[PDB]
Design a binder for this molecule. Structure first.
Ligand SMILES: Nc1ncnc2c1ncn2[C@@H]1O[C@H](COP(=O)(O)OP(=O)(O)OP(=O)(O)O)[C@@H](O)[C@H]1O
Ligand SMILES: Nc1ncnc2c1ncn2[C@@H]1O[C@H](COP(=O)(O)OP(=O)(O)OP(=O)(O)O)[C@@H](O)[C@H]1O
Ligand SMILES: Nc1ncnc2c1ncn2[C@@H]1O[C@H](COP(=O)(O)OP(=O)(O)OP(=O)(O)O)[C@@H](O)[C@H]1O
Lengths: 523, 523, 273, 525
């Protein structure tokens, strides 16, 4: 295709206009005074959201160069949300600040590569500073605060997630799903979780979240890979009139002899899914036995001799709900038999007691933790479908923030930690004055979150920025109550991982992206 | 198609406008102060790169004549990257200089093919001069410098590749692949390398790099060609529900009874690849036996009598990663059995000990070198996908540059050695005054790299060119530290092959290219 | 009126277009086999000429840049004409060749004023060499042939110029008049010549001729400046009573007297030169 | 006519476009290797010139904003011309460099007026540095060289002006005239000069010349205001009966008399040129008495009683020639007796002796200087009237540049003065980063003329610039012979005053137009 090619300042200004559009569209959602935005959906109702990443995904400009810049910054939100699930808006704001100031410097005549290297030096120094300043998160009150603040100062969901992590432990799995009443409910039912994903991206359902859900699925388990379609056709055939969608768990699933002809055979009324089995050998076999007992099913093996053609509907497992994601797949509620589940739990506990090898002990302890923790289910209760998915977004963001906080720790909320590390990093210098200018641009950039939150409050940013810079420790500006105080006392806290990942991704993409002079695109 | 035909100066100026667009878009990436570009991608995120040859590949102009010029100079970068993998930007810059000055001479009325002969005489003299001035590369410090400078003065990757060539020797194979952490990692694992390529260009995966990759492939080996599809259908059928993609190694693979119906069978969910077996007869059989033992597989033969229908999933080989390229195909990691691999290594060593024929000894020594060197794997660790591929590009460029340097030698970096050989060639004269002016055009063109690098630094190109021309030996201008000194001492060195190939390709295409009077295109 | 600028090679190719237009339009008629060129007239029949000056006079192009290039070459052609009297086609043909090759060379990237200096040196050498190659024309026969060739190969004109040349010697003065008879009339009468032009171009009675021809005029001789026309009022009254053309020779003529004389000339009451 | 506004960076880029247009159009002809520029005339042949003033005069753009930018740079060029007389191309080239880097820097988000203050500080330091580096031009050989270079490398003109100052000393008054002979003529005749211009621009007989040149006029001296033209009615009648040009010198001229004189001049019935009365009070009256002695005239005053109406042809002064400049009037070969002039010289010398006030003593000293020194006349000699007037113009601006040189000093030409000063000022800093970048913009802009003239040579600007920077003292690049050396040795010099004024007004207009945010203009119609 014939290419329009732009050089230097023209390319950079088209880039920056597109990036400014996207960053405004995302930054209008930041902070407790953050304001939700409407994303058009052609198939259904318009979607309200405070979730930055879905927004940033939805932007696509008409001018090709502006669109390219917007895609480059959409990468920031995508990477940030995948890493942490929160702070994508923060990452985008840090981006926009860094690109704007770096482009001003470059327009002055600056070398962009030295800016890049200075930005890297400053951002790594900031990573070390936040690691020094990170505080462990505990007491179930800090976690509740993280959830509440993450959900736009929603105390009910913060309390609910605090109760959930109290019950299932700091490492238990919690699932957010559609509720039925007007109230959000907690349902900790028996379930299972294994770190595997779908084999083919054609199993993605109508929702664009990337996780496919099954309405009362039918569980099939296997450790030995079958050979021909005809051996597993009767099971499908039985499934084809069982009533319930089929999820198969195997060591590794092909595309040729399953996916192509299940797509060509079925138009998609009732879905069929196939997933990998984590582990290998005896560990995988024991895990499959545990899953089969949880779902009331059985595991086919060469040694047993029981075959797929002999397998019936009652022999195999069944679950009440199953959600499959690329990162990790969970069976939400497998009915099975409660007495059988308890007997298997006792058997695996005695397996722990007899075992003495460190690897065997730790994997069996992982098994008992998975069985005992269960799955917490969040029934998002609200009046409407728009409020359904909006509250789902805020609840999932709160859950992800709590996860990251217990993974790494917490620091002062509202970007105050950025102010403090910027004050601490004022002395960092680069190889030359060029790298010093880059570090100073990064310094100027890290107060962007506070300024943008205060702007979302309608208050003037520079006043608050200087007021916090005059402060120290955990003194900052509660935007919700429009007053200065200690966040740690009042519970405005960010997870350390969220902040660190956001700043890291933003610095990396911005440093690459301000060094760009030739832009080549279709006309 | 109706042809618009342009003659003489208007044709040549449209040509030159297109060439100038492409050459600017490539030359903005040269040197340590070289600055990255953005190439659009329709399927995914925009690609920020410093790789000049890619920049050449995605340039196409709206005016047909300008598009011709751009394509004919894109040929330069393609040929240069194929030959050496670095210096494509240098080749394009030498082109643009030569075409512009030759067009000025032709606009004066000067005869084109005598200019061509003068250019060839000068460029062959320059080849001999650089061969005289080439210095062998060794000590693992010069290699590290070549890698670092090749990767835009990136010292960490230079140290890493120095360690890699220290471990796997100066001739071992090194693979660059996607990493997982934020850090670039070195993983020297057991693998195989053999100079063979894919049979059909329809096996090219989604990446446009031309090398297909397989995630957990399944290895099949053969020395006797099967006859019918039905004999090898069960293996495929077994593969069709094995879980892993199938790579077949054979003497020579057909298209009629494999490729057509394997494209018609699968839609591209899981790939199936077939490659040629290097060598012939007993050498090919021994290589297949070695590869089957490396992957834990077996080789089908008429003498053995074991048949494809009798072959099972456990009988055949399996690898962790395999990347197939047209030039050379490598199995990155075949698990197999470490004890079996060591036993095969000892057996082949004893085969060396018993053998005395020079050809047998050298091929068995090639076998033991391939087995002992293994495969070095570079896990490109970075924050983002854009930084994934950008760091991959710079690391691969460093790899190719180090390969070329150890293949042929090194000279002064930044074109300083090219300046020196230009100074040494001031006395070369052609058959007539026309050829003399052609030689002088080549002479005035060979200072293009230094000028363009210094311009990328934003500095005064003329003072640097004159200062270096006043200098001698390895005295030149470090662009990174903006100062004049000895390149050998400060480690800025080019591979001799890269520079020689760039100048040869550029001179050939440019002299052949400035002779063009008529241009015939679609309207 | 605002001004539109054009700088760079685009301007150069523009006056190149203009000079090519004018230069071809005038070079067609060069030589004895010079082809006719027809020129429109606002009224009546269009004139048909082989005169390079005549065709070169009215060349003026619609767009301003090539018009201005045509005007520069028109300037040099008329300057050579007033310097020499002939060979204007030759001058502008030489101009076309030199400018075309010069613009080709400067567009080829050489230094323009270095080129100009080289051309100046070459043309100076050509000038001195043509002094070396020059041959005296003191003979009346070559005078007859050159007068013939200049006047469109008319031997009668060259012959008459030869006889007049013999009449007034080497540095005499020859003046053309109109004869009522079908034969040309050659005479020698004492007269006065001095290199002085008219105060105003409006004094010319015949615009095509370019000179003021007066028959039996009263001649006034003055060595003083005519600052006021009141000094010329009795002179005008006397010459109007007598009824003949009037010629004035004075040291200087100021704006007032010149303006009043111009007004009187366009009135049609007196003939004053 | 309605008014359209454009504020913000759009206005900035707009006048940047305008100044780039005009600045290139004038920078092409800079230097001895300056390329020709062709300009259309509404009638006849187009003019071809190397004069920066000429090309800069008729630049105006179709759209209003860049036209305005062109007009600011035009007015600064003309202001420097009237201040100095030469180097207008230099001033506007410096203007282009300073404004382009300044607008680039302000568009980079930093404070424009911090930048302007920094540029002002840097240019003030440059002014004091060039004062330090200025060399006296008392030597007649350097005077001949600078007169040569100013008048397009014509050694004859510089030589003639050199002998002119040899005739009338260091601070004498010299007027160029037209000589009928092919040879140049030089004479010295006692005359008058004073800093007074015409009442109306319509008094100028030659619009291209800009001055009123009159031969053998009747001169009227008055110390009173001409409120009514009825006072000038008998004078007009007498001068119309006599038939010569008329000069009026009066204290003030009101609107009525000026309008009536303008009507009379455009009628074509009389030649009347009126100028103000120079000086003030008793000094003005005394020097008007001196002028009356020089021309044989009489001073008319209301306080004395004798009025403008009671004027005869004998009472008015007379002279052989007069030239009334734009703000100056000079009288050559006055009729009045030299003995009376010598007596007046003695009287004002005794006034000097009895003078006690320094101001009055200096006024009497300049009175005796102008009354005794006289005026040199240089009559240009040539064959053609066209080259007559062209060499006359070359003499005019060459001598004006020579006077600028004599008043202040001379430095090596070719812009290397600016190059050396920029070398000596690399160390100065400002109060913040924006003042520092303003200093840097001024520094790297004041080096532009060398690069532009080398461009005009056809060579590479940067190599010559850095080589001359490396060279120290008066070492630089002869553009004429296109080779290095000392320009003093080969006589390539520029007056200190012209370059100093050029850079001063360039920095002034840059500081004023950098700080342009709102740009109002009339509507496109
Ligand atoms: N009362 C408050 N005072 C100060 N900062 C607050 C307050 N409430 C919330 N914040 C800050 O607002 C941010 C949370 O807002 P929000 O969840 O909308 O965006 P995010 O965490 O940057 O990312 P995302 O777009 O994924 O939601 C955190 O930085 C938190 O510290
Ligand atoms: N500090 C430096 N000083 C001088 N030259 C340098 C310096 N750093 C790098 N170079 C030169 O820059 C070039 C490497 O730049 P780069 O890798 O972008 O381009 P390339 O090698 O010409 O080709 P390609 O487009 O394939 O990368 C080499 O010629 C190297 O000598
Ligand atoms: N031989 C020379 N070598 C180098 N520079 C020279 C030489 N002769 C003159 N110059 C420089 O060239 C400039 C003279 O340019 P030019 O004669 O076109 O007019 P100007 O003085 O710049 O201005 P104006 O427009 O008022 O005529 C001066 O800056 C002078 O120093």
């Amino acid at each position: 295709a014939a290419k329009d090619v732009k050089f230097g300042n023209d390319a950079r200004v088209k880039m920056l206009r597109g990036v400014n559009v996207l960053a405004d569209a995302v930054k209008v959602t930041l902070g407790p005074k953050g304001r939700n935005v409407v994303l058009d959906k052609s198939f259904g109702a318009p979607t309200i959201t405070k979730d930055g990443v879905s927004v940033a995904r939805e932007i696509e400009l008409e001018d090709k160069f502006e669109n390219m810049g917007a895609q480059m910054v959409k990468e920031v939100a995508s990477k940030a949300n995948d890493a942490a699930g929160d702070g994508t808006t923060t990452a985008t704001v840090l981006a926009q600040a860094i690109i704007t100031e770096g482009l001003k410097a470059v327009a002055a005549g600056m070398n962009p590569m030295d800016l890049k290297r200075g930005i890297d030096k400053a951002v790594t120094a900031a990573v070390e500073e936040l690691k020094a300043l990170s505080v462990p998160c505990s007491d179930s009150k800090a976690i509740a605060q993280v959830g509440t603040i993450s959900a736009n100062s929603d105390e009910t969901v913060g309390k609910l997630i605090a109760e959930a992590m109290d019950k299932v432990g700091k490492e238990g799995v919690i699932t957010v799903e559609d509720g039925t009443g007007l109230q959000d409910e907690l349902d900790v039912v028996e379930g299972m979780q294994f770190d595997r994903g779908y084999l083919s991206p054609y199993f993605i359902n109508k929702p664009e979240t990337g996780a496919v859900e099954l309405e009362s699925p039918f569980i099939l388990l296997a450790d030995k890979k079958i050979s021909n379609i005809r051996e597993m056709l009767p099971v499908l055939e039985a499934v084809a009139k069982a009533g319930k969608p089929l999820l198969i768990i195997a060591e590794d699933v092909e595309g040729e002899a399953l996916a192509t002809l299940v797509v060509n055979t079925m138009r998609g009324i009732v879905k069929v899914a196939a997933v990998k089995a984590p582990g290998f050998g005896d560990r995988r076999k024991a895990m499959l036995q545990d899953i089969a007992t949880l779902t009331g099913g059985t595991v086919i093996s060469e040694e047993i001799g029981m075959e797929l053609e002999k397998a019936t509907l009652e022999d195999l497992g069944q679950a009440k709900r199953v959600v499959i994601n690329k990162d990790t797949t969970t069976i939400i509620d497998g009915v099975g038999e409660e007495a059988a589940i308890q007997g298997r739990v006792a058997q695996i506990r005695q397996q722990i007691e007899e075992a003495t090898s460190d690897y065997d002990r730790e994997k069996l302890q992982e098994r008992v933790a998975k069985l005992a923790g269960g799955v917490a289910v969040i029934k998002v209760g609200a009046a409407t479908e728009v409020e359904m998915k909006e509250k789902k977004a805020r609840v999932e963001d709160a859950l992800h923030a709590t996860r990251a906080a217990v993974e790494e720790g917490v620091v002062a909320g509202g970007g105050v930690a950025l102010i403090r590390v910027a004050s601490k990093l004022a002395d960092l210098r680069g190889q030359n004055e060029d790298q010093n200018v880059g570090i100073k641009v990064a310094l100027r950039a890290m107060e962007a979150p506070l300024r943008q939150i205060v702007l979302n409050c309608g208050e003037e940013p520079s006043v608050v920025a200087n007021t916090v810079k005059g402060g120290d420790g955990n003194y900052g500006y509660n935007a919700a109550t429009e007053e200065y105080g200690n966040m740690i006392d009042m519970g405005i806290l960010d997870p350390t991982k969220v902040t660190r990942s956001a700043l890291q991704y933003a610095a990396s993409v911005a440093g690459l992206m301000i060094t760009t002079e030739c832009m080549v695109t279709d006309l």
